[PDB]
């Protein structure tokens, strides 16, 4: 069994590199963030442009959705995070506290908290309703590349250029685990039992974090420079999805670690990929020489 992702739509509009693409939890929309200091909303099934959301002073590195698909959070080079209302396209709150570029962001499953990672080497926890910083973790000794809440929002996994992956207890802020090349990306598996981490040695690793053991190694793609998003594709077959510095989207069989598909269409590094929550749909976004988002669909 191999997927059969076919190109369906190209979403053009951004004037600079696209940095992140995310599908809304309700499966209706796609949000994109860009180096052009803009956020664009698009139809998840048709690629139809919906809205442009502006406010950030410098380029946006990440964007994330609240659980109810009504809010977005963005991480910008202006050292801030902005909570937006997706309906109005208006900035509700501006999260101030980080001393350098905010690189990554995420809401918790409840969507009452926001986790953020920055070049200031820290991980911050914010309250959505008040826009206040609740906890400032001295998480790492190099820029924080990724931050993610687990299934119940009880754990935060962070990664950094220091070469470490840290698992943190949300309410206490304590470090529960440090997993021992720069770590460019990290996230929990949908069940929260595993973590998928990318390193800048062209490698993806599936870890059982509590046991502190790497279970699977995924390679064949190019990744030595960029913090490329990787995903678990679960709607059909079980795949690992990731962009690559060779302008392809890579798809691996989760069990065999074999490459099953390489999606060709982008003219620059594929910085971000997202998997639709209910359909076999992949969104891919590329850098400066491309600036487009592509939507691909499959049987499995």
């Amino acid at each position: 069994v191999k997927p059969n992702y076919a190109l369906k739509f190209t979403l053009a509009g951004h004037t600079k590199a696209v940095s992140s693409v995310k599908f809304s939890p309700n499966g209706e929309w796609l949000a994109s963030s860009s180096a052009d200091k803009l956020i664009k909303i698009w139809g998840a099934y048709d690629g139809k442009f919906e809205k442009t959301i502006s406010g950030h002073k410098l380029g946006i590195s990440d964007v994330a959705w609240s659980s109810d698909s009504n809010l977005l959070v963005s991480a910008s080079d202006d050292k801030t995070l902005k909570i937006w209302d997706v309906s109005s396209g208006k900035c509700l709150k501006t999260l101030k506290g980080h001393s350098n570029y905010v690189f990554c962001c995420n809401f918790n499953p409840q969507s009452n908290l926001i986790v953020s990672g920055s070049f200031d080497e820290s991980v911050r926890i914010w309250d959505v309703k008040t826009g206040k910083c609740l906890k400032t973790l001295p998480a790492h000794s190099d820029p924080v590349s990724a931050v993610h809440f687990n299934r119940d929002g009880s754990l935060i996994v962070s990664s950094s250029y220091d070469g470490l992956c840290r698992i943190w207890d949300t309410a206490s802020g304590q470090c529960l685990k440090t997993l021992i090349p720069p770590v460019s990306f990290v996230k929990f598996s949908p069940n929260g039992k595993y973590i998928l981490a990318a390193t800048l040695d062209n490698t993806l690793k599936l870890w059982d974090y509590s046991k502190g053991k790497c279970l699977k190694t995924y390679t064949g793609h190019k990744n030595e420079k960029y913090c490329i998003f990787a995903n678990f594709s679960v709607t059909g077959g079980k795949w690992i999805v990731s962009g690559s510095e060779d302008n392809l989207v890579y798809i691996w069989n989760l069990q065999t670690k074999e490459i099953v598909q390489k999606l060709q269409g982008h003219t620059d590094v594929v910085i971000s990929t997202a998997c639709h929550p209910t359909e076999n749909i992949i969104a891919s976004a590329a850098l400066e020489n491309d600036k487009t988002i592509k939507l691909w669909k499959s049987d499995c």
Binding site: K16, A17, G59, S61, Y161, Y226, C227
Partner: peptide, 9 residues
Amino acid sequence: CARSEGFYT
């Protein structure tokens, strides 16, 4: 934009 730039040799 930090993500689209990359970094350190």
